[PDB]
Amino acid sequence: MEAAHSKSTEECLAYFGVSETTGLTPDQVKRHLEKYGHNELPAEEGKSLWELVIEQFEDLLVRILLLAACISFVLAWFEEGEETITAFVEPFVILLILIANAIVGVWQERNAENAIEALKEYEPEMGKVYRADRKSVQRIKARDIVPGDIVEVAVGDKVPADIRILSIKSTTLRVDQSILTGESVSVIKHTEPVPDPRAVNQDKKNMLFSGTNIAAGKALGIVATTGVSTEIGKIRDQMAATEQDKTPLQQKLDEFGEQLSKVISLICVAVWLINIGHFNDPVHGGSWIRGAIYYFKIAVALAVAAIPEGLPAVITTCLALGTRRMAKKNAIVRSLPSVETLGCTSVICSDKTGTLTTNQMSVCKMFIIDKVDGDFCSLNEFSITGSTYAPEGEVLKNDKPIRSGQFDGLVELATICALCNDSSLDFNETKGVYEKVGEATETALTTLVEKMNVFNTEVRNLSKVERANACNSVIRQLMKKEFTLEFSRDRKSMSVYCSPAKSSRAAVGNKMFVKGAPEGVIDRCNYVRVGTTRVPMTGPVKEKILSVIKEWGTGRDTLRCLALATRDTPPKREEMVLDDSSRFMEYETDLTFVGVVGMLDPPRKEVMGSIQLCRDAGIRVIMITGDNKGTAIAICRRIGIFGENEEVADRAYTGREFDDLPLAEQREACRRACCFARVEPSHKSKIVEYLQSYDEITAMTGDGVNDAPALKKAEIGIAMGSGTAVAKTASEMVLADDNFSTIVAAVEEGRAIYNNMKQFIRYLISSNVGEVVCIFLTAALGLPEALIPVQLLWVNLVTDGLPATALGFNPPDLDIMDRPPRSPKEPLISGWLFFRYMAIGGYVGAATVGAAAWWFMYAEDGPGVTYHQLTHFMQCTEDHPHFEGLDCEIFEAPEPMTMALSVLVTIEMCNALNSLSENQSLMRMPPWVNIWLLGSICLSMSLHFLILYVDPLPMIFKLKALDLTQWLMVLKISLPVIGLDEILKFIARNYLEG
Ligand SMILES: C/C=C(/C)C(=O)O[C@H]1C(C)=C2[C@H]([C@@H]1OC(=O)CCCCCCC)[C@@](C)(OC(C)=O)C[C@H](OC(=O)CCC)[C@@]1(O)[C@H]2OC(=O)[C@@]1(C)O
Ligand SMILES: Nc1ncnc2c1ncn2[C@@H]1O[C@H](COP(=O)(O)O)[C@H]2OC3(O[C@H]21)C([N+](=O)[O-])=CC([N+](=O)[O-])C=C3[N+](=O)[O-]
Ligand code: NA
C-alpha cells in the first residue's frame, strides 16, 4: 500500500483483511509472502574471480598483447639456435605483464565498495510482529515480514519496513529520520490520515520508514510496503538504474585503442604488399620457414612498439600522488579517474547550510512594539552582539548597551524564546567551543535569552557548563510546559502550552507561546503587546511590522526572521485534540504579537573568494537552500552569486514554482537558474538531468541517504565529511571540512593535474609512433631487426616511465583558473601537434634504423660493408658479395641493437625535455623548471648502463657495452631532435598567432 499515509487506520486494516488484535493468519502470511516477496533489497550480482580475471583480458590492446604473446611463444618453440634460456624470455615478459596487470585489476575489485550495498546497513536483522498463530509478540527476521503485518516498535528499535502507525502506546512517539529527511531532531508521529496522496516524506507524520530509529516511545503499526517498495527501496532502485559514464579520458583511451588496433593491422598488410615480389622467387631454394618467422617476428615487435605498455601505471601513479595532495587540502577523492572530471566541472550545485555557511546561527536583531496610537506606531529595535553559540555578547539600542530586563516586552520575548523551544546549549570541554544541541535556529534563541538575561540572575559567578543554560533555567521555573505543538511546514509555526508553576486554587492563566515564520504567525494575531499592555492589531501596526521584516530578510542583513506571539486565552486543555496535527493552526489563533527576531547564518570566510574564482574559471554556481525565496536571493547577492542589483526573476525558483513550470520551461530554467529554494530530494536529480541535457559537467553536494541518487547521477557527487556513509560511498569526493571552498580548490587541482597528464600522455604515445616507424622501416627495407620486443618493453615500462612520471610534476600555469572549463570532447593530439609527432616519429624511426645500419656499414668495429646493403640478403647460402672467407651470422650481433636502443633512449630523454611545454621554447622554459625531471633522466640513463654492464642483463636484452666513439655517434644523431621540435614550436608560436 504506497498511499497508506492518506488512508485511515481502519482503511489500512480493511485493505489487507487483517485484524489489529490478532494479525495475519498463516495462510495470509504464505499468500502475502508469495505476492510481495521477502522484505529485503535484492542481493548484489555475484561477480566471480574467473569472471573477473577474464574481464582484464577484454581490453583491445591487452588482446593484441596476448596474441603477440602466443606468436612469441610459438616462435620460441619452432626455432633455430641452441640457447635454451635466451628464447622463452620474450614471451614470459609479455605474459608476466598481462598477469601483473590482472593481479591489480582484481585487487581493485575485492577492495571496491558499492553504494547500493551500503544501504543494507539500514535493514535490521529482526522485527516484532503479532500473528494469529500466537498470542504474544513474536520476534522474527526482518526479511520474513510482509505488508499487512501487525508490527510493534519500541525505543532504540530500527524500523524494519514502511509502516502505517495504528496506535501509539506511549505519551509520544519520537523518531530519528535524519538519514531520510535531513530532520536533525527526532520527530513526533501521529496516527490520523495525511490527506495529500502525494505528500513528501516529512509530512507523513503517521508513517514509520524502514531504516529509521525510534528515539522515544512505543507504537503499533501495519506494514504498508516492504523490500524495493519502501522509501529506501525506491532510493535503491533509482541508484541501480543510474548508469555512469566513462570519463572523457577513458573514452579517448578506448578510441585510441580502436584506432591503434586498426593501424597495426594496416601496417601488417603494408609489410605484406611491400614484399609482394617474393611471389616472383623460384619455389626451389630459399627458405619459406625462415622468411615466415621474419614476418611474425616483426608483427610481434609491431604490437609491442605500438602499445604504450607503461602508460596505465604512469596515469595511476600520477593520480595517487595528486589524490594524496588533495587530501591535505580536505578533498578526499574516492575514484582516481574522477580527478579529470573534477577538472572539467562546469556547474557546482551546493547546499547552503554548513557548506556555503558556517551553520552557526546567531540572532543579531530583534524588536517589539513600542507604542500604538491611531495611525501612529513605533517599534523598539535592538542589536545583539556575539556571532558564537556562546553567551558572549550583549544587547544594544543605537549601539549603546542596555538592560534587557528593563523592557517588559523583551521579558516576554525571552520567555517565548526559552519555553517555545526543544533545543539547548552544550559547552563541549574536549574542544572549548560551544555546540548546538538540536535545531540551529532554536539554539540561537537559547543563546539569545542567556545574553538578554532578563531577570538579572548572577552568572559572572558560575562556571562554563553552568553558563550554558542559566537564564533559561530561570524562565523554566516560571511555567509548567504541558505539551508542545511541533513545527510543520504547512503552518510554519510551533507553540507550547504552559500553565503557571506557582498556582494554588486557580485553573486560570494558562498561556500558549508561539514562534514561526512571520507571515502566518502575524496573520493569526488579533492583538499586539505593548510593554505589559495589549491593544487591537490594526492595519498600520501590521504594515510597520511586515515592512521591517521585509528589510531584515530581503535586505543586505540576509536574516532569517521569526515572529513570536502568545495566546493570552488559549483553549481549555481538555478541549484540545493533540493527536490531530491538522487542528494545530487553529489552536494558534487569536494570538498576541510580541516580537520578531532576526538571525544570521554567516557565509564561510573563504566563500566569497571562491565564488569569484568560479566566475573567473567559467564555472556556474547554483545554491540549494531551505530559506524562503526572498532570503535565498538576498544570500546569493551577499556572497556574489547574483549582483547586488541584477534582475533575477527567472534565475531563482522555489520547488513549488519549478514544479508549476511545464517540462520544457523547467529545462530552460535550469540553464539560467542560480538559486533553488525549498526543493525536495527529487529536484536535485531532475536538476542534474536537465543540466546533463546541455552537456554540463555537474558537481552536486549531498549528505543523506535521500541525496544518494543525485550524487550518483552527477559527474561529481560531493558528500559531506560530517554526513552519512551512504552519501560518502555514492560520491566521487568527500569534503572533510564540509566547505564549499574545498570544492573550488579541488577543481583547480584537477585542472593542473590534467594538464600535466596531457604532457606525459603525448610524450609516451609519441615514442610509440617513433618505435613503430623503426619496425616498419626495418621490414620495409629488409633490414635486420634494430630493436626487439624485450628492449622496447624495458624502454616503455622503465626508461620512459620515469620521465613521464616526472612530467606529472610540471609546474602549473599561473592562469589555470582564468580560463573556461575544458571541453570534454577536446582531443589530446590534433592538427599541428599531430604533424609535430608525425615528424618526430619519422625522425626517431630513421634515427634508430640509421644507428643499427651505420654500425653494420661505416663503423670500424663492425664489418665496414659500406653501401653493401643488408637489403641484399639475410639468406646466407648464396655467399655472393663476400668473395673469400668463412664468417656470416654477424647479422645477429648485439652491437647494432645497442646503437639503436641507446639512440632511442637518448632521444626519449631529449623528448621528455621537449614535453615540459607544448609550445614554449627551452630558451624561455628551461629544463631546470622541473628538478624531478632532470633527476629522473639521470636515473633512466643509470639504468641503461645497468642493463649494458651488469652481466646477467646484457645477454638477456641482447646488448653489448658501447665504445666512447659509438656513444659519440649516439649523441650526434640523437641531440638534433631538440632542434627539430624547437623549430616546430617556433612555427606554431608565430604563424598561428590569432
Ligand atoms: C601509437 C603508434 C602508432 C604508429 C599509431 O599510428 O598511432 C596513431 C593513433 C592511434 C593516433 C595517432 C597516430 O596516428 C599516426 O601516427 C598516423 C599513422 C602513421 C602510419 C604509420 C606507418 C608506418 C596519434 C597517437 O599520434 C600522431 C602522430 O598523430 C595521435 C592521437 O593520439 C591521442 O590523441 C592520444 C589519445 C590517447 C590519435 O589521433 C590516435 O588515434 C586517435 O584516435 C587519437 C585522436 O587518439
Ligand atoms: N520545503 C520547506 N518548506 C518550508 N520550510 C522549510 C522547507 N525546507 C526547510 N525549511 C525550513 O528551513 C530550515 C532548514 O534549513 P536548510 O539548512 O535545510 O536549508 C528549517 O528550520 C525551520 O524550518 C525549516 C524549523 N524546522 O523545524 O525545520 C523550525 C522553525 N521553528 O519555528 O523553530 C523554523 C525553521 N526556519 O527555517 O525558520
Ligand atoms: Na556521481
PDB file of C-alpha atoms in Angstrom, residues 696-824:
ATOM      1  CA  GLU A 696      27.301  20.435 -18.424  1.00  0.00           C
ATOM      2  CA  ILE A 697      29.726  18.555 -16.211  1.00  0.00           C
ATOM      3  CA  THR A 698      27.963  18.997 -12.883  1.00  0.00           C
ATOM      4  CA  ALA A 699      29.068  18.750  -9.270  1.00  0.00           C
ATOM      5  CA  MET A 700      26.254  18.281  -6.726  1.00  0.00           C
ATOM      6  CA  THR A 701      26.542  18.213  -2.942  1.00  0.00           C
ATOM      7  CA  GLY A 702      24.698  15.762  -0.676  1.00  0.00           C
ATOM      8  CA  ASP A 703      24.714  14.268   2.819  1.00  0.00           C
ATOM      9  CA  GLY A 704      21.819  11.905   3.491  1.00  0.00           C
ATOM     10  CA  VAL A 705      20.519   8.708   2.020  1.00  0.00           C
ATOM     11  CA  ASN A 706      17.934  10.830   0.176  1.00  0.00           C
ATOM     12  CA  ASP A 707      20.817  12.649  -1.625  1.00  0.00           C
ATOM     13  CA  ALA A 708      22.348   9.357  -2.756  1.00  0.00           C
ATOM     14  CA  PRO A 709      20.564   9.114  -6.128  1.00  0.00           C
ATOM     15  CA  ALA A 710      21.534  12.646  -7.164  1.00  0.00           C
ATOM     16  CA  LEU A 711      25.089  12.176  -6.005  1.00  0.00           C
ATOM     17  CA  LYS A 712      25.264   9.022  -8.163  1.00  0.00           C
ATOM     18  CA  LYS A 713      23.813  10.815 -11.189  1.00  0.00           C
ATOM     19  CA  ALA A 714      26.142  13.855 -11.079  1.00  0.00           C
ATOM     20  CA  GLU A 715      29.526  13.581 -12.796  1.00  0.00           C
ATOM     21  CA  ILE A 716      30.954  14.719  -9.440  1.00  0.00           C
ATOM     22  CA  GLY A 717      28.849  13.703  -6.460  1.00  0.00           C
ATOM     23  CA  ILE A 718      30.182  15.500  -3.409  1.00  0.00           C
ATOM     24  CA  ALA A 719      29.494  14.262   0.085  1.00  0.00           C
ATOM     25  CA  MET A 720      29.937  15.980   3.401  1.00  0.00           C
ATOM     26  CA  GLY A 721      32.637  14.790   5.813  1.00  0.00           C
ATOM     27  CA  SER A 722      30.051  15.063   8.551  1.00  0.00           C
ATOM     28  CA  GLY A 723      27.427  13.169   6.534  1.00  0.00           C
ATOM     29  CA  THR A 724      26.192   9.578   6.167  1.00  0.00           C
ATOM     30  CA  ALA A 725      28.409   6.792   4.953  1.00  0.00           C
ATOM     31  CA  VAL A 726      25.849   6.036   2.217  1.00  0.00           C
ATOM     32  CA  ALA A 727      26.244   9.528   0.768  1.00  0.00           C
ATOM     33  CA  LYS A 728      30.007   9.053   1.022  1.00  0.00           C
ATOM     34  CA  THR A 729      30.009   5.777  -0.860  1.00  0.00           C
ATOM     35  CA  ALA A 730      27.795   7.247  -3.602  1.00  0.00           C
ATOM     36  CA  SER A 731      30.125  10.194  -4.182  1.00  0.00           C
ATOM     37  CA  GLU A 732      33.282  10.949  -6.210  1.00  0.00           C
ATOM     38  CA  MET A 733      34.614  13.230  -3.490  1.00  0.00           C
ATOM     39  CA  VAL A 734      34.134  13.852   0.205  1.00  0.00           C
ATOM     40  CA  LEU A 735      34.746  17.207   1.844  1.00  0.00           C
ATOM     41  CA  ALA A 736      36.411  16.521   5.191  1.00  0.00           C
ATOM     42  CA  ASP A 737      35.661  20.143   6.256  1.00  0.00           C
ATOM     43  CA  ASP A 738      32.212  20.387   4.516  1.00  0.00           C
ATOM     44  CA  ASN A 739      33.477  23.645   2.980  1.00  0.00           C
ATOM     45  CA  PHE A 740      32.359  24.756  -0.498  1.00  0.00           C
ATOM     46  CA  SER A 741      35.864  26.238  -0.871  1.00  0.00           C
ATOM     47  CA  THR A 742      37.345  22.765  -0.802  1.00  0.00           C
ATOM     48  CA  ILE A 743      35.340  22.109  -3.977  1.00  0.00           C
ATOM     49  CA  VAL A 744      36.832  25.074  -5.816  1.00  0.00           C
ATOM     50  CA  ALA A 745      40.345  24.142  -4.690  1.00  0.00           C
ATOM     51  CA  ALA A 746      39.759  20.548  -5.821  1.00  0.00           C
ATOM     52  CA  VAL A 747      38.674  21.743  -9.257  1.00  0.00           C
ATOM     53  CA  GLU A 748      41.816  23.831  -9.730  1.00  0.00           C
ATOM     54  CA  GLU A 749      43.901  20.850  -8.639  1.00  0.00           C
ATOM     55  CA  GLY A 750      42.029  18.821 -11.258  1.00  0.00           C
ATOM     56  CA  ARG A 751      42.861  21.295 -13.966  1.00  0.00           C
ATOM     57  CA  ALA A 752      46.583  21.296 -13.086  1.00  0.00           C
ATOM     58  CA  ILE A 753      46.897  17.529 -12.744  1.00  0.00           C
ATOM     59  CA  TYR A 754      45.202  17.038 -16.103  1.00  0.00           C
ATOM     60  CA  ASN A 755      47.468  19.493 -17.916  1.00  0.00           C
ATOM     61  CA  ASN A 756      50.476  17.505 -16.710  1.00  0.00           C
ATOM     62  CA  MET A 757      48.789  14.253 -17.697  1.00  0.00           C
ATOM     63  CA  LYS A 758      48.444  15.685 -21.209  1.00  0.00           C
ATOM     64  CA  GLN A 759      52.167  16.233 -21.465  1.00  0.00           C
ATOM     65  CA  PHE A 760      53.073  12.726 -20.332  1.00  0.00           C
ATOM     66  CA  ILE A 761      50.400  11.067 -22.447  1.00  0.00           C
ATOM     67  CA  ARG A 762      51.665  12.934 -25.503  1.00  0.00           C
ATOM     68  CA  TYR A 763      55.258  12.069 -24.546  1.00  0.00           C
ATOM     69  CA  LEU A 764      54.720   8.335 -24.131  1.00  0.00           C
ATOM     70  CA  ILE A 765      52.465   7.940 -27.122  1.00  0.00           C
ATOM     71  CA  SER A 766      54.853   9.994 -29.234  1.00  0.00           C
ATOM     72  CA  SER A 767      57.608   7.431 -28.554  1.00  0.00           C
ATOM     73  CA  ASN A 768      55.280   4.584 -29.634  1.00  0.00           C
ATOM     74  CA  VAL A 769      54.807   6.207 -33.034  1.00  0.00           C
ATOM     75  CA  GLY A 770      58.623   6.669 -33.180  1.00  0.00           C
ATOM     76  CA  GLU A 771      59.130   2.981 -32.368  1.00  0.00           C
ATOM     77  CA  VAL A 772      56.621   1.737 -34.925  1.00  0.00           C
ATOM     78  CA  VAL A 773      58.290   3.757 -37.711  1.00  0.00           C
ATOM     79  CA  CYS A 774      61.507   1.909 -36.790  1.00  0.00           C
ATOM     80  CA  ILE A 775      59.831  -1.511 -37.047  1.00  0.00           C
ATOM     81  CA  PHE A 776      58.046  -0.544 -40.245  1.00  0.00           C
ATOM     82  CA  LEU A 777      61.228   0.885 -41.704  1.00  0.00           C
ATOM     83  CA  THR A 778      63.073  -2.308 -40.791  1.00  0.00           C
ATOM     84  CA  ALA A 779      60.531  -4.541 -42.569  1.00  0.00           C
ATOM     85  CA  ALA A 780      60.261  -2.156 -45.500  1.00  0.00           C
ATOM     86  CA  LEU A 781      63.975  -2.130 -46.309  1.00  0.00           C
ATOM     87  CA  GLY A 782      64.559  -5.840 -45.490  1.00  0.00           C
ATOM     88  CA  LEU A 783      66.944  -4.947 -42.634  1.00  0.00           C
ATOM     89  CA  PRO A 784      67.868  -6.975 -39.532  1.00  0.00           C
ATOM     90  CA  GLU A 785      65.757  -6.034 -36.552  1.00  0.00           C
ATOM     91  CA  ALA A 786      67.151  -2.893 -34.958  1.00  0.00           C
ATOM     92  CA  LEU A 787      65.057  -3.429 -31.784  1.00  0.00           C
ATOM     93  CA  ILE A 788      63.404  -6.435 -30.206  1.00  0.00           C
ATOM     94  CA  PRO A 789      60.276  -6.600 -28.040  1.00  0.00           C
ATOM     95  CA  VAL A 790      62.230  -7.125 -24.809  1.00  0.00           C
ATOM     96  CA  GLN A 791      64.215  -3.910 -25.403  1.00  0.00           C
ATOM     97  CA  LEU A 792      61.137  -1.864 -26.354  1.00  0.00           C
ATOM     98  CA  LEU A 793      59.370  -3.237 -23.274  1.00  0.00           C
ATOM     99  CA  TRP A 794      62.148  -2.077 -20.961  1.00  0.00           C
ATOM    100  CA  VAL A 795      62.035   1.357 -22.576  1.00  0.00           C
ATOM    101  CA  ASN A 796      58.255   1.648 -22.379  1.00  0.00           C
ATOM    102  CA  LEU A 797      57.998   0.406 -18.825  1.00  0.00           C
ATOM    103  CA  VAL A 798      61.153   1.749 -17.286  1.00  0.00           C
ATOM    104  CA  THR A 799      63.282   4.124 -19.392  1.00  0.00           C
ATOM    105  CA  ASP A 800      60.406   6.397 -20.434  1.00  0.00           C
ATOM    106  CA  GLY A 801      58.220   5.563 -17.413  1.00  0.00           C
ATOM    107  CA  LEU A 802      60.316   7.663 -15.055  1.00  0.00           C
ATOM    108  CA  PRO A 803      60.442  10.877 -17.119  1.00  0.00           C
ATOM    109  CA  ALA A 804      56.722  10.523 -17.911  1.00  0.00           C
ATOM    110  CA  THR A 805      56.080  10.343 -14.163  1.00  0.00           C
ATOM    111  CA  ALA A 806      58.282  13.360 -13.599  1.00  0.00           C
ATOM    112  CA  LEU A 807      56.274  15.318 -16.190  1.00  0.00           C
ATOM    113  CA  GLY A 808      53.293  14.833 -13.865  1.00  0.00           C
ATOM    114  CA  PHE A 809      55.172  17.258 -11.610  1.00  0.00           C
ATOM    115  CA  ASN A 810      55.312  20.060 -14.231  1.00  0.00           C
ATOM    116  CA  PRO A 811      54.679  23.455 -12.583  1.00  0.00           C
ATOM    117  CA  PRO A 812      51.127  24.571 -13.256  1.00  0.00           C
ATOM    118  CA  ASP A 813      50.286  27.565 -15.407  1.00  0.00           C
ATOM    119  CA  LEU A 814      49.535  30.756 -13.412  1.00  0.00           C
ATOM    120  CA  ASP A 815      46.261  31.381 -15.314  1.00  0.00           C
ATOM    121  CA  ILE A 816      44.771  27.878 -14.645  1.00  0.00           C
ATOM    122  CA  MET A 817      41.614  29.406 -13.123  1.00  0.00           C
ATOM    123  CA  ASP A 818      41.378  32.235 -15.677  1.00  0.00           C
ATOM    124  CA  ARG A 819      40.099  30.070 -18.489  1.00  0.00           C
ATOM    125  CA  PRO A 820      36.730  28.380 -19.213  1.00  0.00           C
ATOM    126  CA  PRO A 821      36.239  24.728 -18.328  1.00  0.00           C
ATOM    127  CA  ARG A 822      37.988  22.389 -20.744  1.00  0.00           C
ATOM    128  CA  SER A 823      35.699  20.851 -23.344  1.00  0.00           C
ATOM    129  CA  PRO A 824      35.237  17.145 -22.611  1.00  0.00           C
TER     130      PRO A 824
END
